[PDB]
Amino acid sequence: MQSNAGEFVDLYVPRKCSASNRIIGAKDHASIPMNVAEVDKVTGRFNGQSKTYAICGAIRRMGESDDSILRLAKSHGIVSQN
Amino acid sequence: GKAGDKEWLPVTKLGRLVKDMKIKSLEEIYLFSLPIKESEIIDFFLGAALKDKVLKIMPVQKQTQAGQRTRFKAFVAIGDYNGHVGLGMKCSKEVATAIRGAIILAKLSIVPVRRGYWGNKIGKPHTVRCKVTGRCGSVLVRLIPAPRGTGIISAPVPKKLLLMAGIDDCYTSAGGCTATLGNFAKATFDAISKTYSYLTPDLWKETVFTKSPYQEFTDHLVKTHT
Amino acid sequence: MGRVRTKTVKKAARVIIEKYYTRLGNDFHTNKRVCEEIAIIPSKKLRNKIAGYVTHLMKRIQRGPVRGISIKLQEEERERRDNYVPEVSALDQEIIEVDPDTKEMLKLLDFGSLSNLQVTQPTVGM
Amino acid sequence: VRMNVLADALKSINNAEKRGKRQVLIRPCSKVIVRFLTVMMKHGYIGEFEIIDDHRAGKIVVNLTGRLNKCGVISPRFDVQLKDLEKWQNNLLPSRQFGFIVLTTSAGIMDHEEARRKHTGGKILGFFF
Amino acid sequence: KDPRRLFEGNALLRRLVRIGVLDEGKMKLDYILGLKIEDFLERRLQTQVFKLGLAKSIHHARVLI
Amino acid sequence: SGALDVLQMKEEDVLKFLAAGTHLGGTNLDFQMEQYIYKRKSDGIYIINLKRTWEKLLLAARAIVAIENPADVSVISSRNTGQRAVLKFAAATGATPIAGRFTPGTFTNQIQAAFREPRLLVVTDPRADHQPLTEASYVNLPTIALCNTDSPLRYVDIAIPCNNKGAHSVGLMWWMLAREVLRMRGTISREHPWEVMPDLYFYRDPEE
RNA sequence: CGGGAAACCAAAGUCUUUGGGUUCCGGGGGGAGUAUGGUUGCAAAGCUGAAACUUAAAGGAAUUGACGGAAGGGCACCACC
């Protein structure tokens, strides 16, 4: 949303679904993401450091949010042979 | 002014962050898509310097045992002039309450508007990024971007809503029973709100995004009560 | 019947009992005195009607926990009861008896286990 | 039966993206479908696609992101006169700025921007944004 | 660059500027689009004969003229 | 694997699971659950993928850690088989509770006396606990859930396939979650075994 | 999902983001399927089908009472027993 002199105008840049790459817009409160903890490898020891995904109202109402998370979590770990 | 400010106290964590000066703009709420249940939140973050215009009064009624009943319905719109607006309809026993509640309802509903450039983007957005339409029970309003000086070409009621929204120039076409005002304003309200939903190519790329002020402020938003 | 206690009364009874159980009693005569000490009630007939219904409750509570009333002592009693656990029941006794496939469930799960086979017959819907 | 084949491919796509789908199998495909899928691709509105070869007419798999609000087809394929292109994009595009009208000209199936630059014109195929 | 746009655009601008109605950055078409009535109204006699003392009223001005 | 090793399967657990008869799965699959399914037993019944049941449970556990204030993860059950179960989970991990008649207007509706703003809901039957699952979707709160093969997938992100027909399957899975979360961001340390007997989770019930 | 004014509708969906093929009928309500000419019919009638004039609502859907010689309901010696 540039303006004349490369300036950034209007007022915000919305987050985009983690499954459908579609704008979460802005009053659709039937939607939320999901912070997964990073682990200090080895195992346990929750260390931050979120691995995070945002899922749209749409996907969730269509009886996905879950799987989407899995394509999301495995593709970037953890989660394997799902 | 001096009348003795109330004592808002918040039900909601979102509210605590706002009063604490932890949340400062609605954008945070909008990006997070936090629901807003306490009207004061809207009041503190914006609304200050936001003006509410009452659109309509028309009465209705329904039948009692021993005959009749009748009551007042008020249609209220709220918005600064830039980028924020809300719409609220209420029916109540008394005009004042109907208006007073309507305003509250309008504020809760406040919505983002994405305002854009008819084409050559100099000196900040005059119109709308794309063309967005909204329908409410057979009335449908279509907003179209227009060149500068075009202004809001809409019916008076719609012009008023679009005005508060902060749109400078826009073309409109309306189909359906335009007469039923509650419907027409509602559709236009849906239309404007749809601008944020449009994905343009500018938007195509993504983002660490945010952690949510709810999470960072979490302690802050569990005070010392219960 | 004709005497159905109204909420203003019934509420007070639930009320007192919640904050008064170990104080209150089995007997009308005494709670009635107690309502003077632990509550401010405007007419004597009301206070009587209250004492009376709350006693009907105490009589009932002291014979089985009653649908919506909680007191510190009753919580403690349930707490202690809610401990029980024997020799224990599964065992299940030497050797699990499987339905097979459930046998093939372990067999193809990389898992040793105790055994027994009796799993055959199909198998109608409804 | 079938009059056109493009219109089916486009619709199939649109319903895929509307569902929340990330792939589609269109059938049966054609040189024109490829060319249109291709113009879309150059611009970002779809990912990569693949023509599978049944011994028949073809089947395409399109992998789609989600930048696509709509890809429509215009029927019939009206003739356009260089200053009817200006009239078309306004009729059916979101802002002057973006979205493409894609037509077929003597010098190739192209988006109207490429049309304006070449300085040729022709008959209108469809659009997207 | 379109001979029609160039030849007539520049002319509209130059005409709009001779009368002071319009200014240079304006003085392109992108700016006339973002213009208004006062800008014309400001150039009539009447308001000038005020604007340099020689009337002291938009009033006086019109009866003077 | 992933996070790197020890965290994998452990026969010890695959033993508790098979014992508790989790994997047994519903005769009616349901479409969104098809992935969980390992194989269909003869005489109709499906074998859930314990390996899959396992890993997701861990994925669940991890999402429960990362919530900073442990209290505001709500473990929920109106089902009896899961009532002591969740009460126990809430005792160990921070985790506030919601058993029995969920009470409508608990997430929407400030005014109410069971008003809660969780940052994570964990539900045990998405069909029995449909109210909480719906209310949660009125206010942007993620959901872990107990799902057998034929449970509603609407508004639930993250499933852990179970059996939820019942027994100890509901007991063990809540147990293992609390066991897992205490390990992560907690302080069990040494994704080594339990001083707590898993029976402690598990339904009570009646009396003669 | 989405549609529709709703009742409803997996088609009445993919319709203002309005464009897959083709065919038919309607443009407030009455006058009227009437007059009149043509046509078909043994006949009874059928098809095509106006106007003058008349009139500001005709109509649809949902909502709620009122009311029922509709169904289950009750309550009272201003009801019966």
Short mmCIF file of C-alpha atoms in Angstrom, two decimals, chain B:
data_model
loop_
_atom_site.label_atom_id
_atom_site.label_comp_id
_atom_site.label_asym_id
_atom_site.label_seq_id
_atom_site.Cartn_x
_atom_site.Cartn_y
_atom_site.Cartn_z
CA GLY B 1 -15.40 20.12 29.73
CA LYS B 2 -16.18 19.05 33.29
CA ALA B 3 -18.97 16.66 34.26
CA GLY B 4 -17.11 14.05 36.29
CA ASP B 5 -15.84 11.14 34.22
CA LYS B 6 -17.44 7.81 35.10
CA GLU B 7 -15.52 4.83 36.49
CA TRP B 8 -15.41 2.35 33.65
CA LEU B 9 -14.16 -0.74 34.91
CA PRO B 10 -13.38 -3.47 32.54
CA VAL B 11 -14.86 -6.92 32.28
CA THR B 12 -12.34 -7.84 29.55
CA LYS B 13 -8.59 -8.35 29.31
CA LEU B 14 -8.63 -6.54 26.01
CA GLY B 15 -10.09 -3.66 27.97
CA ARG B 16 -7.42 -3.69 30.65
CA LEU B 17 -4.70 -3.34 28.07
CA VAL B 18 -6.54 -0.39 26.55
CA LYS B 19 -7.05 1.54 29.78
CA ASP B 20 -3.48 0.79 30.81
CA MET B 21 -2.34 2.41 27.59
CA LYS B 22 -1.12 -1.04 26.61
CA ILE B 23 -3.40 -1.12 23.59
CA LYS B 24 -3.41 2.19 21.75
CA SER B 25 -5.17 1.69 18.42
CA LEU B 26 -8.08 -0.42 17.19
CA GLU B 27 -5.79 -1.76 14.55
CA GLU B 28 -4.30 -4.08 17.10
CA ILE B 29 -7.72 -5.48 17.77
CA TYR B 30 -8.55 -5.61 14.07
CA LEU B 31 -5.34 -7.42 13.09
CA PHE B 32 -5.90 -9.89 15.89
CA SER B 33 -9.60 -10.06 15.17
CA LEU B 34 -10.27 -9.76 18.86
CA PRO B 35 -13.94 -9.56 19.52
CA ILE B 36 -15.01 -6.42 21.31
CA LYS B 37 -17.65 -6.70 24.00
CA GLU B 38 -17.10 -3.61 26.14
CA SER B 39 -18.21 -0.47 24.37
CA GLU B 40 -15.83 1.71 26.34
CA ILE B 41 -12.95 0.02 24.56
CA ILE B 42 -14.11 1.49 21.31
CA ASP B 43 -14.78 4.71 23.20
CA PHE B 44 -11.25 5.04 24.53
CA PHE B 45 -9.44 4.04 21.47
CA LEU B 46 -11.46 5.99 18.97
CA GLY B 47 -14.84 7.42 19.10
CA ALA B 48 -13.12 10.05 21.02
CA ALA B 49 -13.70 12.67 18.41
CA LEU B 50 -15.99 10.25 16.60
CA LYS B 51 -19.44 11.55 15.70
CA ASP B 52 -22.74 9.65 15.68
CA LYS B 53 -25.62 10.53 13.38
CA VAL B 54 -29.09 9.15 13.85
CA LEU B 55 -30.49 7.87 10.55
CA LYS B 56 -34.09 6.96 11.33
CA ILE B 57 -36.84 6.69 14.02
CA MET B 58 -39.62 4.70 12.39
CA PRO B 59 -42.00 3.01 14.83
CA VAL B 60 -43.44 -0.48 14.58
CA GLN B 61 -45.71 -2.79 16.61
CA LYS B 62 -47.01 -6.41 17.79
CA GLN B 63 -50.33 -7.66 19.36
CA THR B 64 -51.03 -8.13 23.09
CA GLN B 65 -53.82 -10.17 24.67
CA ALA B 66 -55.98 -7.16 25.53
CA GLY B 67 -55.19 -5.43 22.29
CA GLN B 68 -51.96 -3.44 21.11
CA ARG B 69 -48.25 -2.41 21.63
CA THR B 70 -46.03 0.12 19.89
CA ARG B 71 -42.30 1.14 20.24
CA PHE B 72 -39.42 3.31 18.70
CA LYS B 73 -36.64 1.96 16.48
CA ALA B 74 -33.54 4.03 15.92
CA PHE B 75 -30.88 3.59 13.30
CA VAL B 76 -27.53 5.00 14.25
CA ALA B 77 -24.27 5.27 12.42
CA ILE B 78 -20.93 6.18 13.96
CA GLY B 79 -17.53 6.96 12.47
CA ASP B 80 -14.71 9.34 12.60
CA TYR B 81 -13.99 10.66 9.18
CA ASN B 82 -11.18 8.41 8.58
CA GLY B 83 -11.41 4.82 8.01
CA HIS B 84 -13.70 3.80 10.86
CA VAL B 85 -17.45 3.32 10.93
CA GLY B 86 -20.18 1.36 12.65
CA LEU B 87 -23.93 0.88 12.28
CA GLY B 88 -26.53 0.09 14.91
CA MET B 89 -30.26 -0.43 14.93
CA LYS B 90 -32.23 -0.58 18.14
CA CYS B 91 -35.85 -0.63 19.14
CA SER B 92 -36.82 0.43 22.60
CA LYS B 93 -39.55 1.83 24.77
CA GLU B 94 -38.21 5.37 24.60
CA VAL B 95 -36.48 7.40 21.91
CA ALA B 96 -33.62 8.42 24.11
CA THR B 97 -32.81 4.87 25.09
CA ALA B 98 -33.31 3.66 21.57
CA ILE B 99 -30.76 6.20 20.42
CA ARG B 100 -28.48 5.68 23.39
CA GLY B 101 -28.40 1.94 22.89
CA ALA B 102 -28.12 2.25 19.15
CA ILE B 103 -24.99 4.29 19.53
CA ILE B 104 -23.55 1.64 21.79
CA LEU B 105 -24.47 -1.01 19.27
CA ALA B 106 -22.94 0.98 16.45
CA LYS B 107 -19.65 1.35 18.28
CA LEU B 108 -19.34 -2.35 18.99
CA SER B 109 -19.72 -3.00 15.28
CA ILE B 110 -17.06 -0.49 14.15
CA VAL B 111 -15.32 -1.70 11.07
CA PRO B 112 -12.14 -1.09 9.14
CA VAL B 113 -12.34 0.60 5.77
CA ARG B 114 -9.67 0.16 3.18
CA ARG B 115 -9.61 3.36 1.13
CA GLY B 116 -7.59 3.45 -2.06
CA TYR B 117 -6.69 5.26 -5.26
CA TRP B 118 -8.76 5.54 -8.42
CA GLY B 119 -5.47 5.03 -10.15
CA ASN B 120 -2.79 7.52 -9.68
CA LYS B 121 -1.81 7.36 -6.20
CA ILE B 122 -0.67 10.79 -5.26
CA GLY B 123 -1.41 12.53 -2.01
CA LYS B 124 -3.28 9.69 -0.31
CA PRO B 125 -6.12 7.65 -0.85
CA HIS B 126 -9.31 9.34 -2.11
CA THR B 127 -11.59 6.41 -2.82
CA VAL B 128 -11.46 2.63 -2.78
CA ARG B 129 -8.92 0.00 -3.82
CA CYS B 130 -11.49 -2.09 -5.70
CA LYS B 131 -15.23 -2.47 -6.19
CA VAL B 132 -17.09 -4.09 -3.31
CA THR B 133 -20.75 -4.93 -3.00
CA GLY B 134 -22.93 -5.99 -0.12
CA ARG B 135 -26.42 -7.42 0.10
CA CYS B 136 -29.00 -7.39 2.86
CA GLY B 137 -32.31 -9.10 2.29
CA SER B 138 -32.73 -8.07 -1.35
CA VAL B 139 -31.07 -4.66 -1.26
CA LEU B 140 -27.56 -4.65 -2.65
CA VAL B 141 -25.13 -1.80 -2.81
CA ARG B 142 -22.15 -1.63 -5.10
CA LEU B 143 -19.31 0.78 -4.47
CA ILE B 144 -17.05 1.72 -7.36
CA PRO B 145 -13.86 3.73 -7.20
CA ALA B 146 -14.11 7.11 -8.85
CA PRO B 147 -11.89 9.94 -9.87
CA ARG B 148 -11.20 12.91 -7.65
CA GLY B 149 -13.96 15.45 -7.31
CA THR B 150 -16.52 12.73 -8.13
CA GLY B 151 -17.47 12.60 -4.46
CA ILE B 152 -19.96 10.23 -3.00
CA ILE B 153 -22.57 9.55 -5.60
CA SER B 154 -25.13 7.78 -3.50
CA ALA B 155 -28.48 8.33 -1.87
CA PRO B 156 -28.47 10.71 1.02
CA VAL B 157 -28.59 8.01 3.66
CA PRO B 158 -25.79 6.09 2.04
CA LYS B 159 -23.76 9.21 1.43
CA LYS B 160 -23.91 9.90 5.15
CA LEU B 161 -22.52 6.50 6.06
CA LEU B 162 -19.84 6.62 3.40
CA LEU B 163 -19.01 10.15 4.54
CA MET B 164 -18.33 9.08 8.13
CA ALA B 165 -16.36 6.12 6.83
CA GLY B 166 -14.13 8.69 5.30
CA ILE B 167 -14.59 7.94 1.67
CA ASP B 168 -13.99 10.98 -0.52
CA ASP B 169 -15.11 9.79 -3.93
CA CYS B 170 -17.05 6.69 -4.90
CA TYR B 171 -19.65 5.62 -7.45
CA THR B 172 -22.61 3.63 -6.30
CA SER B 173 -25.28 1.54 -7.89
CA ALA B 174 -28.11 0.11 -5.78
CA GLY B 175 -30.57 -2.67 -6.64
CA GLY B 176 -33.47 -4.09 -4.68
CA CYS B 177 -36.06 -2.36 -2.57
CA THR B 178 -33.94 0.65 -1.71
CA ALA B 179 -36.89 2.11 0.17
CA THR B 180 -36.44 -0.06 3.29
CA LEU B 181 -33.66 2.01 4.75
CA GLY B 182 -32.54 -0.44 7.39
CA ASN B 183 -31.69 -2.89 4.62
CA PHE B 184 -29.97 -0.37 2.32
CA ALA B 185 -27.66 1.00 4.99
CA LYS B 186 -26.91 -2.51 6.16
CA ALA B 187 -25.87 -3.63 2.70
CA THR B 188 -23.72 -0.59 2.19
CA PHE B 189 -22.22 -1.25 5.59
CA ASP B 190 -21.40 -4.75 4.43
CA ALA B 191 -20.08 -3.35 1.21
CA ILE B 192 -17.54 -1.02 2.83
CA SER B 193 -16.49 -3.66 5.32
CA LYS B 194 -15.70 -5.97 2.42
CA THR B 195 -12.79 -3.80 1.32
CA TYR B 196 -10.56 -5.27 3.99
CA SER B 197 -11.52 -8.72 2.75
CA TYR B 198 -10.40 -8.01 -0.79
CA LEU B 199 -6.96 -9.40 -1.49
CA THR B 200 -5.03 -7.27 -3.93
CA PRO B 201 -1.61 -8.00 -5.24
CA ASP B 202 -0.19 -5.48 -2.80
CA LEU B 203 -1.28 -7.83 -0.05
CA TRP B 204 0.28 -10.90 -1.63
CA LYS B 205 3.03 -11.10 0.81
CA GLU B 206 3.02 -12.65 4.35
CA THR B 207 4.54 -12.32 7.79
CA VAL B 208 5.82 -13.15 11.23
CA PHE B 209 2.63 -11.12 11.74
CA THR B 210 2.08 -10.68 15.49
CA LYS B 211 2.12 -12.41 18.93
CA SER B 212 -1.09 -10.67 20.08
CA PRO B 213 -1.14 -8.09 22.79
CA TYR B 214 -3.28 -10.51 24.76
CA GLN B 215 -0.34 -12.91 25.12
CA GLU B 216 2.43 -10.38 25.77
CA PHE B 217 0.27 -8.33 28.11
CA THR B 218 -1.13 -11.53 29.57
CA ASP B 219 -0.17 -10.79 33.18
CA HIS B 220 -1.26 -7.34 32.69
CA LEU B 221 -4.60 -8.67 31.59
CA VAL B 222 -5.10 -10.85 34.65
CA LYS B 223 -5.13 -8.05 37.23
CA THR B 224 -5.16 -8.82 40.95
CA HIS B 225 -8.72 -10.10 41.25
CA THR B 226 -10.67 -13.00 40.23
#
